[PDB]
Amino acid sequence: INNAYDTIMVYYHKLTAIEGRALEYNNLEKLFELQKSNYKQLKDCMNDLKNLKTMWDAIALIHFQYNDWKTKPWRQIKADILLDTNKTLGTQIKNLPKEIRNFKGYNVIVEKVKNMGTVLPLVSALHSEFMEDRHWSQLKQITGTVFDHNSLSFYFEDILALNLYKYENTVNEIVDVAQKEAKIEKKLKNIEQWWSKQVFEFTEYKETKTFASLDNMMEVLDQHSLDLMGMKSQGKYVEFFY
Amino acid sequence: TTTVTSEDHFMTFYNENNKKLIVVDVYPGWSGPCTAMYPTYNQLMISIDDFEKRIDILLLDQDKLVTYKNDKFHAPKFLFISEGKIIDEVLGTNIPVFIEKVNKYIPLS
| Interacting residues of A201 by C-beta distance below 8 A, sequence separation 6+ | A212, A213
Contact B49, B56 (CB under 8 A): yes
Q: Are A169 and A223 in contact (CB under 8 A)?
A: no
Please give the helix or strand (H or E) that residue B86 lies within, else none.
Answer: strand B86-91
d(CA B58, CA A83): 33
Structural contact between residues A158 and A176, judged by C-beta atoms closer than 8 angstroms: no
Name the phi and psi angles at A102, rounded to 5. Answer: 60, -145
Chain A: closest CA distance from residue B109 (Å)? 9
- How many Cβ contacts (< 8 angstroms) between chains A and B? 18
Contacting residues of A for B54, CB less than 8 Å apart: 1, 57, 60
Collapsed DSSP state (helix, strand, coil) of residue B88:
strand
Q: Are A130 and A179 in contact (CB under 8 A)?
A: yes
Tell me, in Å, the resolution of the deposited structure. Answer: 4.0
Chain B touched by A8 (CB under 8 Å): no
